[PDB]
Amino acid sequence: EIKELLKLGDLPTSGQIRLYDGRTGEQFERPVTVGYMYMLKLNHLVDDKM
C-alpha cells in the first residue's frame, strides 16, 4: 500500500532517487533513499547546559 501510494504520488516506488552532490556536483551511485520524517526538538538545548 505504501508502494501504491508512492505510485499515486508519481514518486519512485523504492523511494531511492538519484542525488547530486552539493559541493562537487557529481552523480551519486547507489541512489540514496529520501523522505519526509517527523523530528522533534528535545528539552536539552545547549544554551542551558553550557
Partner 1 sequence: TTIKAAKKMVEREEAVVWDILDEVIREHPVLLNRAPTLHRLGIQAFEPVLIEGKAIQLHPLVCAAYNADFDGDQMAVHVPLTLEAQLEARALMMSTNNILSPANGEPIIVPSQDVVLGLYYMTRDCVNAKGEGMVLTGPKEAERLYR
Partner 2 sequence: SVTEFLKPRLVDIEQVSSTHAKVTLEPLERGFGHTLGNALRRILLSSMPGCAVTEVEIDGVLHEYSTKEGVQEDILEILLNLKGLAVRVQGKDEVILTLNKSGIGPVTAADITHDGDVEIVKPQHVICHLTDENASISMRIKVQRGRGYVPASTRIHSEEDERPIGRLLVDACYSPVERIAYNVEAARVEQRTDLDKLVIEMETNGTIDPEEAIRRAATILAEQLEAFVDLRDVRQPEVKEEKPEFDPILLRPVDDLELTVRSANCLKAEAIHYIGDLVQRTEVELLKTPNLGKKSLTEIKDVLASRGLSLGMRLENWPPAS
Partner 3 sequence: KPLVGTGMERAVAVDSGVTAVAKRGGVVQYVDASRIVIKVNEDEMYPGEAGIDIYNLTKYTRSNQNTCINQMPCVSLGEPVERGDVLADGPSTDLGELALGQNMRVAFMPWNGYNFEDSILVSERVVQEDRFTTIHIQELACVSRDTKLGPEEITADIPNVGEAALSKLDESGIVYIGAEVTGGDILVGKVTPKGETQL
Distances (CA, A) of 18 to 15, 22, 48: 10, 13, 40
- Of the ranges 6-14, 15-23, 39-47, which one interacts with partner 1 (CB under 8 A)? 39-47
Instruction: Note whether 21 binds partner 1 by CB under 8 A.
Output: no
5 Cβ contact partners less than 8 Å away, ≥ 6 residues apart: none
Instruction: Note whether 43 binds partner 2 by CB under 8 A.
Output: no
Residues 9-38 that bind partner 3 (CB under 8 A): 19, 28, 32-38
How many chain residues touch partner 3 (CB under 8 A)? 13
What whole-number distance in Å separates Cα of residue 50 and Cα of residue 36? 32
